Design an enzyme around this catalytic site. Sequence first.
Site, PDB file in Angstrom:
ATOM      1  N   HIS B 128     -12.057 -14.306  -9.050  1.00 37.47           N
ATOM      2  CA  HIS B 128     -12.715 -14.200 -10.359  1.00 37.47           C
ATOM      3  C   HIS B 128     -13.691 -15.347 -10.632  1.00 37.47           C
ATOM      4  O   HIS B 128     -14.814 -15.124 -11.077  1.00 37.47           O
ATOM      5  CB  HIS B 128     -11.683 -14.149 -11.493  1.00 37.47           C
ATOM      6  N   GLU B 129     -13.252 -16.576 -10.372  1.00 32.25           N
ATOM      7  CA  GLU B 129     -14.084 -17.750 -10.628  1.00 32.25           C
ATOM      8  C   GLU B 129     -15.356 -17.719  -9.783  1.00 32.25           C
ATOM      9  O   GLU B 129     -16.448 -18.014 -10.270  1.00 32.25           O
ATOM     10  CB  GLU B 129     -13.300 -19.024 -10.364  1.00 32.25           C
ATOM     11  N   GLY B 203     -18.746   5.225   9.367  1.00 30.48           N
ATOM     12  CA  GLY B 203     -17.694   5.576  10.309  1.00 30.48           C
ATOM     13  C   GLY B 203     -16.640   6.497   9.723  1.00 30.48           C
ATOM     14  O   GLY B 203     -16.745   6.917   8.583  1.00 30.48           O
ATOM     15  N   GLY B 249       3.309   9.231   2.638  1.00 33.10           N
ATOM     16  CA  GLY B 249       4.554   8.642   3.093  1.00 33.10           C
ATOM     17  C   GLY B 249       5.674   9.657   3.096  1.00 33.10           C
ATOM     18  O   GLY B 249       5.425  10.851   3.195  1.00 33.10           O
ATOM     19  N   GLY B 251       7.574  10.352   0.657  1.00 34.05           N
ATOM     20  CA  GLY B 251       7.783  10.873  -0.683  1.00 34.05           C
ATOM     21  C   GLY B 251       7.083  12.209  -0.875  1.00 34.05           C
ATOM     22  O   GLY B 251       6.432  12.715   0.030  1.00 34.05           O
ATOM     23  N   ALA B 260     -16.299  15.909   2.284  1.00 36.99           N
ATOM     24  CA  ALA B 260     -16.429  15.666   3.717  1.00 36.99           C
ATOM     25  C   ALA B 260     -15.342  16.435   4.470  1.00 36.99           C
ATOM     26  O   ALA B 260     -14.467  17.030   3.855  1.00 36.99           O
ATOM     27  CB  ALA B 260     -16.328  14.179   4.009  1.00 36.99           C
ATOM     28  N   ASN B 262     -12.049  16.410   6.057  1.00 38.99           N
ATOM     29  CA  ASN B 262     -10.909  15.505   5.936  1.00 38.99           C
ATOM     30  C   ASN B 262      -9.754  15.899   6.842  1.00 38.99           C
ATOM     31  O   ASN B 262      -9.446  17.078   6.985  1.00 38.99           O
ATOM     32  CB  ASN B 262     -10.376  15.477   4.499  1.00 38.99           C
ATOM     33  N   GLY B 267       3.128  13.885   5.827  1.00 43.66           N
ATOM     34  CA  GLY B 267       4.332  13.167   6.215  1.00 43.66           C
ATOM     35  C   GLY B 267       5.566  13.915   5.732  1.00 43.66           C
ATOM     36  O   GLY B 267       5.451  15.059   5.326  1.00 43.66           O
TER      37      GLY B 267
HETATM   38 CA   LIG Z   1     -15.629   2.258   8.273  1.00 44.37          CA
HETATM   39 CA   LIG Z   2       5.494  17.132   4.031  1.00 45.34          CA
HETATM   40 CA   LIG Z   3       4.881  12.970   1.984  1.00 40.26          CA
HETATM   41 CA   LIG Z   4     -12.789  18.113   2.432  1.00 40.67          CA
HETATM   42 CA   LIG Z   5     -16.562   6.907   6.145  1.00 47.07          CA
END
Ligand SMILES: [Ca+2]
Ligand SMILES: [Ca+2]
Ligand SMILES: [Ca+2]
Ligand SMILES: [Ca+2]
Ligand SMILES: [Ca+2]
Lengths: 6, 382
Positions: B128-129, B203, B249, B251, B260, B262, B267
């Site tokens: 911050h400073e 990337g 995760g 959960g 884009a 994806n 999980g």
């Molecule tokens: Ca990147």
């Molecule tokens: Ca799952």
């Molecule tokens: Ca999950």
């Molecule tokens: Ca997409």
């Molecule tokens: Ca990217």
Amino acid sequence: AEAAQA
Amino acid sequence: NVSWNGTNVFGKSANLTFKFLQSVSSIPSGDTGFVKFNAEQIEQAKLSLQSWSDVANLTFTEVTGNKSANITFGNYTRDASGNLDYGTQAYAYYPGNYQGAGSSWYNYNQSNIRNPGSEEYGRQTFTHEIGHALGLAHPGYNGHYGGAPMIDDIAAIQRLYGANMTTRTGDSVYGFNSNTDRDFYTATDSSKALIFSVWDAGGTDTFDFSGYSNNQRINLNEGSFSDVGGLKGNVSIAHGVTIENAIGGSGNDILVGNSADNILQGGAGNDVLYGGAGADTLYGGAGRDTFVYGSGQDSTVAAYDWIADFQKGIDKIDLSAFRNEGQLSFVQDQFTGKGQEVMLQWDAANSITNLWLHEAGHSSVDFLVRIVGQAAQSDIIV
Ligand SMILES: [Ca+2]
Ligand SMILES: [Ca+2]
Ligand SMILES: [Ca+2]
Ligand SMILES: [Ca+2]
Ligand SMILES: [Ca+2]
Ligand SMILES: [Ca+2]
Ligand SMILES: [Ca+2]
Ligand SMILES: [Cl-]
Ligand SMILES: [Cl-]
């Protein structure tokens, strides 16, 4: 000018 | 609006110097009891400087001796009256030509200031400073503090000095298994809280939040906030940044992609995955997962989704959003032409199920999701 941190 | 390049000058880079004062004749605030930075303060201050130069066109070069510097660091311990000050925290001065411009000052009587590497508020204070010493008017979770610039800080600093387009232009991983070499982007075990706004200049990138068992909400949209590792709105994606992939995760998570292509992995646990526009590849993982489609544009034939680990009788594909134009009917092996029809077609040779949806008002069948594995009609939510 001055800024202070909480 | 002020910066090291003057007043009302925007998008101009700056090469700046910084210095850890070894002594002073006076502190511009009138505070006294000067104390030079210790080794830990020095390291953490450099990490804070780096987090700024990461996002904007700034370079920082340390100077020593009697050389003047744009940005300086020093501690104080007492007020102008010479009495011990254990109450205040820190302050800094705007860029400029006046005496003490760009200087920043920290209360050495605060343990968080002396130990900024182990007391998160200390590192945040440095960040911050420095932000203010750069020209930001107002820089800046279960008791934790983010150590790096947040979404508005990033926008503002880039407005002043221009965005840094050389930063992490390769395939970057944020969270667990990070390759960023930044502590604020890195989680080493499930007890590590993450608080950051990601700047990334190119990337194919991944949000790896696989180490958490909390229910998470992960959003890959530019400028959006995620609820990560049991915290809320602790993660965000800076304006101007595209993150491609996400890993939840154990959960019950929600993963929201962007326009884009994806790769989303749920999980373990029961997850909701939403690819959005573009050709996405979706892994529900173990558990009862739901793959959501919100419009025909989500999975066109020319850029279709893959669902790569579908579990017949366990996972779901949600097409309820298509109701708004007439509820979908299931057809077995042929379309009628009426539209608003859904067909599952088994490709025995490849073990692929093609989900075809003929949408109302379309002359051709324009919606396709390809599924690696079998799917039943009762797996589809209409
Ligand atoms: Ca990147
Ligand atoms: Ca799952
Ligand atoms: Ca999950
Ligand atoms: Ca997409
Ligand atoms: Ca990217
Ligand atoms: Ca599953
Ligand atoms: Ca899609
Ligand atoms: Cl730097
Ligand atoms: Cl990279």
